[PDB]
């Protein structure tokens, strides 16, 4: 199955209220495995998954230094972006940075990406071919130019096609137990009502890995993505995920309603109705 | 393993 490693970085200006916040996290698939909090007392890159714990001091000392050198840059970049957009220092703004590599089931490189965003909006993005840049506005053009002068795209291409996948492959076989599993969902359905006009049919899918899952209702083949109360796939906390999809249905018409579950751990896509 | 640089905006 496909696997991917992603690094997420957030910095927000807190004017007159101490240092800018800076949070970094590392995921493999949907499993976090490292963190660095600028406010944390340790000032260290720390492990957040059992299989990353065996990495030696080399690793923690080295990453620790890189992530600090990151925060130092982002502290400045907040200043720089206020200048591009001519903004006062009284407000709080948000820099976001995500990069990572996607590999297929043969653990071969598929896709690299590395994207920035200011105040929730897409700011600048590395392309699919890992050479050009997408720069949204005036301000990002000023960043793009500096990143062509400083041959940044080429630095990233070498990381994504090289060291990124090289270490995703490490993390996978080290956390083979965790990352290469597919726990399939335990599925049940609840029927509950308050009035007589209608009852609500809810379709559950619990403790399953990875988070990718599809839940859809129907009235004999027709997509009932209508009264389709659908909650975001959420974490259980034990490394698995949860999701349910609900419909409210006129009484006594639970026969025609069925819920389709589709997941990587299910041989046949699993169907169920109320009993 | 991180990308070692944070390039300046």
């Amino acid at each position: 199955g496909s696997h991917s490693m992603r690094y997420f970085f957030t910095s927000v200006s807190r004017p007159g209220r101490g240092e800018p916040r800076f949070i970094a996290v590392g995921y493999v698939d949907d499993t976090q495995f490292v963190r660095f909090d600028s406010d944390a007392a340790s000032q260290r890159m720390e492990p957040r998954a059992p299989w990353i714990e065996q990495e030696g001091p080399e690793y923690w000392d080295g990453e620790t230094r890189k992530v600090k050198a990151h925060s130092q840059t982002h502290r400045v970049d907040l200043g720089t972006l206020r200048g591009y957009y001519n903004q006062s220092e009284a407000g709080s703004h948000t820099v976001q940075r995500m990069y990572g590599c996607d590999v297929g089931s043969d653990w071969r490189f598929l896709r690299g990406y590395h994207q920035y965003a200011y105040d929730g909006k897409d700011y600048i993005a590395l392309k699919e071919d890992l050479r050009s840049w997408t720069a949204a506005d005036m301000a990002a053009q000023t960043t793009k130019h500096k990143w062509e002068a400083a041959h940044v795209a080429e630095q990233l291409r070498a990381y994504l096609e090289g060291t990124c996948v090289e270490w995703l492959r490490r993390y996978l076989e080290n956390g083979k137990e965790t990352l290469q599993r597919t726990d399939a969902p335990k599925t049940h359905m609840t029927h509950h009502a308050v009035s007589d006009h209608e009852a609500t049919l809810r379709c559950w899918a619990l403790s399953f890995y990875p988070a990718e899952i599809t839940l859809t209702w129907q009235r004999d083949g027709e997509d009932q993505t209508q009264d389709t109360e659908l909650v975001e796939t959420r974490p259980a906390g034990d490394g698995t995920f949860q999701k349910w999809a609900a419909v409210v249905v006129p009484s006594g018409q639970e026969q025609r309603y069925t819920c389709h579950v589709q997941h990587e751990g299910l041989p046949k896509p699993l169907t169920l109705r109320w009993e | 393993r991180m990308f070692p640089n944070a390039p300046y905006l």
Epitope: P57, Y59, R65, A69, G162 | -
Partner: antibody, heavy 121, light 110 residues
């Protein structure tokens, strides 16, 4: 007793092509990269490039990108350092060495014995 | 290279000599250092790995460290057999490649 055995010494004319070899043994060949180090006569060590034989991905130092090609053969546990056009200044000793990562471990735990290359009109 | 080693080091049998190895934030700064020994006429050997560890076949008189952008190899109690070229080497982030220092030729003055 993991080991790296390199091809025999070579003397060549400029413009000829040449592919020296580095065969491994005593370890899982695909789990480790092979790199490739130059030592000009009288001078010190320079990293040339590497190949990850597991996935055939292969990189080079900027000095050597485009002057050589570094491939491998998973089955025969062989890595290669290859020229198309030799210079007179390619005359040097060429070591191969087995390394596992670019990190962070890192380090060239076993080295080959060295292949001497001579180039002269 | 952007990592620098003094070409010469000297000591009488039994003395201690450090060998400085001086780089930058991108090589020795954020990545690990390893040391290799080359008795002339031979391929080089892994001497210190992970900044400061010793392979099985290396005696404890050799010892390495690493602070900031500088790493030092310490040979504590020299012997005849120790006169060789000594090379530090760190991955450089700007080059996506390793860089060796120019080497340090060590002499024993018997």
């Amino acid at each position: 007793q993991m080991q790296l055995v390199q091809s025999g010494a070579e003397v060549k004319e400029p413009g000829e092509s040449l592919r020296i070899s580095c065969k491994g043994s005593g370890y899982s060949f695909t789990n480790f990269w092979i790199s490739w180090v130059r030592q000009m006569p009288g001078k010190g060590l320079e990293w040339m490039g590497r190949v990850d034989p597991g996935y055939s991905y292969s990189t080079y130092s900027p000095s050597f990108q485009g002057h050589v090609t570094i491939s491998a053969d998973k089955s025969t546990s062989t890595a290669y350092l290859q020229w198309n056009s030799l210079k007179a200044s390619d005359t040097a000793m060429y070591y191969c060495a087995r390394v596992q990562y670019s990190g962070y471990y890192d380090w060239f735990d076993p080295w080959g014995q060295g292949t001497l290359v001579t180039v002269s009109s | 290279a952007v990592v620098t080693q003094p070409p010469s080091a000297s000591g009488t049998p039994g003395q201690r000599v450090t060998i400085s190895c001086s780089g930058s934030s991108s090589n020795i700064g954020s990545n690990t250092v390893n040391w290799y020994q080359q008795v002339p006429g031979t391929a080089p050997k892994l001497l210190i790995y992970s900044n400061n560890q010793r392979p099985s076949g290396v005696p404890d008189r050799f010892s390495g460290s690493k602070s900031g952008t500088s790493a030092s190899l310490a040979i504590s109690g020299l012997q005849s057999e120790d006169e060789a070229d000594y090379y530090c080497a760190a991955w450089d982030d700007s080059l996506n490649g390793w860089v060796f220092g120019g080497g340090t030729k060590l002499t024993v003055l018997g």
